[PDB]
Amino acid sequence: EYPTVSEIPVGEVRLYQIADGVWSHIATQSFDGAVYPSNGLIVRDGDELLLIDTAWGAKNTAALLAEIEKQIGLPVTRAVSTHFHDDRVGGVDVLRAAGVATYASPSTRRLAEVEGNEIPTHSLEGLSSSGDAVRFGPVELFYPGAAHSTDNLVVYVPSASVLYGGCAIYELSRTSAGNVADADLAEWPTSIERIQQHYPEAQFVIPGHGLPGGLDLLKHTTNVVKAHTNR
Ligand SMILES: NCc1ccc(C(=O)N[C@H]2Cc3cccc(C(=O)O)c3O[B-]2(O)O)cc1
Ligand SMILES: [Zn+2]
Ligand SMILES: [Zn+2]
Ligand SMILES: [Zn+2]
């Protein structure tokens, strides 16, 4: 029942309710002639919503906000971007213009600037060392160490045992490396181990791209990254 890449035209956004007050958002984007799905998260915080990640571009993110207003009808007041690439910050200007306060770690803000990408306004403190965690409204933000990118964060929703891994976690159908130009292959398995150690109770694990599963997605990702290391 989870929407798949073949079911979502580029420019449209789907919402998937995971638990009371917890949804993923799913969009698609063209990249080198192929179409990829991408996931983010929406978490209810009282009568407001917290958004995790844009929907990969300004047009998709505008559609995301329209879809949230239509289907949920509560204001998105804050958003967190889990790393500096365009599937996570692309659309931050649309969010900002809509009154959403945008956040990212200082590491992400710096890398986005260097890269010429959109830059979340607010800096999240307390995430600069591997293994650091902070509570941000209804979620916990965790810096596991460098993996898909040096700045990547993961997000946990304690009320629903939902772990959103972002692009540091691969879906099961992905059996070879994705986009790894900015990755730290040497540290990626260690960073995943920090995730497993901190969130052993996670029930629903969401990759940056594709289908959710359980905690098996962590060991899956390690296997793929190690095989790519040994290419
Ligand atoms: N300057 C080189 C460069 C250009 C684009 C991207 C980029 O936007 N990458 C995103 C889109 C994408 C495209 C294909 C696979 C993935 C993935 O997460 O593996 C994926 O997620 B990224 O965050 O790395 C990264 C580096
Ligand atoms: Zn990335
Ligand atoms: Zn502000
Ligand atoms: Zn990605």
Numbering used by the authors: 32 to 262
What does the paper say about this structure?
We obtained high-resolution structures for VIM-2 and BcII in complex with 2 to 1.5 Å and 1.9 Å resolution, respectively. In both these structures, the electron density for the inhibitor clearly defines the geometry of the boron as tetrahedral (sp3). The mode of binding of 2 observed here, in which both boron-bound oxygen atoms participate in bidentate coordination of the Zn1 ion, most closely resembles that predicted for the tetrahedral oxyanion formed during β-lactam hydrolysis, with the implication that these inhibitors act as mimics of this state. First, one oxygen atom of the inhibitor C-3 carboxylate coordinates to Zn2; the other carboxylate oxygen interacts with Lys224 (NDM-1 and BcII) or Arg228 (VIM-2) by hydrogen-bonding/electrostatic interactions. Second, both the BcII and VIM-2 structures reveal that in the MBL-active sites the bicyclic phenyl-boronate ring of 2 is very similarly positioned to the cephalosporin dihydrothiazine ring (or analogous penicillin/carbapenem derived rings), with both being positioned to make hydrophobic interactions with the conserved Trp87 and Phe61 residues. Notably, the ‘endocyclic' boronate ester oxygen of 2 coordinates to Zn2, mimicking the coordination of the cephalosporin-derived dihydrothiazine ring nitrogen in the anionic intermediate. Third, the binding mode of the side chain of 2 is analogous to that of the 7β side chain of cephalosporins, in that the carbonyl oxygen of the 7β-acetamido group of the side chain of 2 and the cephalosporin intermediate are both positioned to hydrogen bond with the main chain NH group of residue-119 (Ala (BcII), Asp (VIM-2) or Glu (NDM-1)). The pro-(S) boron-bound exocyclic oxygen coordinates with Zn1 and is positioned to hydrogen bond with Asn233 and the NH of the acetamido side chain. The pro-(R) boron-bound exocyclic oxygen bridges Zn1 and Asp120, mimicking the proposed position of the hydroxide-derived oxygen in the oxyanion intermediate.
The β-lactamase-catalysed hydrolysis of β-lactam antibiotics (BLAs) is of central importance in antibiotic resistance. β-Lactam-based inhibitors (for example clavulanic acid) of the Class A serine-β-lactamases (SBLs) are widely used in combination with penicillins. We demonstrate through biochemical, biophysical and cellular evidence that cyclic boronates are potent inhibitors of both SBLs and MBLs. The cyclic boronates act as ‘transition state analogues' for both ‘serine' and ‘metallo' enzymes and therefore represent a promising strategy for combating antibiotic resistance. The combined results reveal that cyclic boronates act as dual action inhibitors of SBLs and MBLs by mimicking a common high-energy tetrahedral intermediate; they also reveal that cyclic boronates can potently inhibit some PBPs via the same mechanism.
